[PDB]
């Protein structure tokens, strides 16, 4: 109804065998979505939207391995819960099966019979479809051809905040229970509601195919540093219900022109120290070779900061990111790239100040026709 995200991605590690990669939580596979309020109770259609991004290798194709841990698209699961946000479906019993849709890898039954007049050509889109389109498609449709391929959740809505629920109803929710907040601000801001949840939403990113006719297999792997190129751990929280990571990995859209991510990650740093840090990105071509997976450099690299140098933190909303290439010693040196332009907006304002005050400003074309998109949401 707002076409947009609501709550942070509750994060579950899932095993290789269609099983919980963390089995210890097999009973505590729980999320409590906070901040629910008047508009939240009257939000016309809210859906808990589950995805699986298959960790491990690129493909389940026999003949080649891939560098284990490769986040690959595997589909979406959706049901609207507006009936339940009304509270009607009121039972701890209801272990809702969730029919999951893997993005349409239909290459098993429609291929065995095409004879006597073959005139048809197409590409490989079984996952290459924009996640925007998969999103809206599952929005409009009302059936899943899961064939059992789905997941089970028992659900209810509970009034009260983290505290009140965690006191009157801690039976469901202990302090080790995973938590996901609806991404934003409340209808009632208590003085001292000290959060730091900076949900970084990856909407998409455009990348030109380059020398290899395969659109270089983008894996935006962005590392958050101080103002001295020092990476920090946990800074990028990949999803809710799980601790952060030092550097975050993007889904390697397998030879895609304009990948659309829809990914979200929380940032939370020392609010006094976060002011004087930065971030850096890496855009590598991820080929089907492990040794080439590691040996390939991030043909494009990028770097972004935290506050505007005036001290104001980067404002909310979408902030574009250029994929910069070539010499990344320019762009991985502790401070030297902090002197250099690192994202679209600061670059065009640099070019404007050169237009008015031309003081040796020649933008490098390594800031080439590849770029990246991030929208910043900062619940500090």
């Amino acid at each position: 109804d707002q076409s947009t995200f609501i709550s942070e991605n509750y994060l579950i590690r899932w095993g290789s065998n269609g099983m919980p990669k963390e089995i210890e939580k097999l009973n505590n596979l729980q999320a409590v979505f906070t901040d629910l309020s008047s508009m939240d109770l009257i939000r016309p259609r809210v859906s808990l939207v589950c995805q699986i991004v298959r960790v491990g290798h690129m493909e389940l194709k026999e003949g080649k391995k891939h560098t284990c841990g490769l986040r690959r698209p595997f589909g979406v699961a959706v049901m609207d819960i507006t009936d339940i946000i009304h509270g009607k479906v009121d039972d701890e019993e209801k272990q809702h099966f969730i029919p999951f849709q893997q993005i349409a890898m239909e290459t098993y039954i429609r291929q065995r019979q095409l004879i006597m007049s073959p005139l048809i050509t197409s590409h490989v889109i079984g996952e290459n479809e924009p996640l925007t389109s998969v999103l809206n498609k599952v929005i409009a449709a009302k059936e899943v051809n899961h064939k059992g391929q789905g997941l089970w959740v028992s659900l209810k809505l509970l009034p009260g905040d983290l505290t009140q629920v965690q006191k009157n109803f801690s039976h469901l929710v202990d302090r080790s229970t995973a938590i996901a907040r609806k991404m934003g601000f409340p209808e009632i801001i208590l003085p001292g509601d000290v959060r730091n949840d900076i949900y970084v939403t990856l909407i998409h990113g455009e990348f030109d195919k380059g020398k290899k006719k395969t659109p270089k297999n983008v894996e935006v792997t962005m590392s958050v540093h101080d103002e001295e190129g020092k990476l920090l751990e946990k800074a990028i929280h990949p999803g809710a219900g799980y601790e952060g990571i030092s550097e975050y990995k993007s889904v390697v859209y397998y030879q895609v022109k304009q990948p659309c991510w829809y990914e979200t990650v929380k940032v939370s740093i020392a609010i006094e120290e976060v002011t004087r840090c930065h971030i850096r990105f890496t855009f590598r071509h991820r080929s089907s070779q492990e040794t080439r997976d590691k040996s390939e450099r991030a043909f494009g690299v990028a770097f972004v900061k935290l506050m505007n140098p005036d001290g104001t933190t980067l404002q909310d909303g979408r902030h574009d990111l250029v994929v910069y290439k070539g010499d990344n010693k320019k762009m991985e040196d502790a401070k030297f790239y902090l002197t250099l332009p690192g994202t679209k907006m600061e670059m065009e304002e640099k070019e404007l100040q050169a237009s008015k005050n031309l003081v040796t400003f020649t933008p490098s074309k390594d800031s080439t026709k590849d770029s990246f998109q991030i929208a910043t949401l900062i619940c500090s």
Binding site: F97, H146, K147, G148, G150
Partner: protein, 181 residues
């Protein structure tokens, strides 16, 4: 007119009588039929040849096995109905059904019928069986039964959708009219 005693065997709650009542009487039994055994008669055609079927709706119970094994003599084709929703019925076909019909009729042709092929894709059946630690009988699994227990053909039926019912019984007949090699 040529009759074939086609004693339809198979577990309880798996779809013998559902397939028969969809065949001889053309209705889908709503609830698990309490079966001892029955006699029917219909008029069916087999690959262009019309045939008579005097049929037997035997029990899937362990209790009246003596009566069902009295039914096995004079049988010319054994229709074993096992639930695709309940592949433990397939396992019972592997342990008792085919072995008992063969101990009472060796080399007498056997049709193998996978009841509820419509449930291999239905969400309820798949989810129930995955929660039971088993998968609905794939046509390869029933075909493995057929090759192993020398079934003339492994068919599948869905009495709910009226799927393959007449086909099941025509194949049962042609298991005898045209002996399989």
């Amino acid at each position: 007119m040529q009759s074939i005693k086609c004693v339809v065997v198979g577990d309880g709650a798996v779809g013998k009588t559902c397939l028969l009542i969809c065949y001889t009487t053309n209705a889908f039994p709503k609830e698990y039929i309490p079966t001892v055994f029955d006699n029917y008669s219909a008029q069916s055609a087999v690959d262009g040849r019309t045939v008579n079927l005097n049929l037997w709706d035997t029990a899937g119970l362990e209790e009246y096995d003596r009566l069902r094994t009295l039914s096995y003599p004079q049988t010319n084709v054994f229709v074993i109905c096992f639930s695709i929703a309940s592949p433990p019925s397939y396992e019972n076909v592997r342990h008792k059904w085919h072995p008992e019909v063969c101990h009472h009729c060796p080399d007498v042709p056997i049709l193998l019928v996978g009841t509820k092929k419509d449930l291999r894709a239905q969400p309820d059946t798949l989810r129930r069986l995955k929660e039971q630690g088993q998968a609905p009988i794939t046509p390869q699994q029933g075909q493995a039964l057929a090759k192993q227990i020398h079934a003339v053909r492994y068919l599948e039926c869905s009495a709910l959708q009226q799927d393959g019912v007449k086909e099941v019984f025509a194949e049962a007949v042609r298991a005898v009219l045209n002996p399989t090699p």
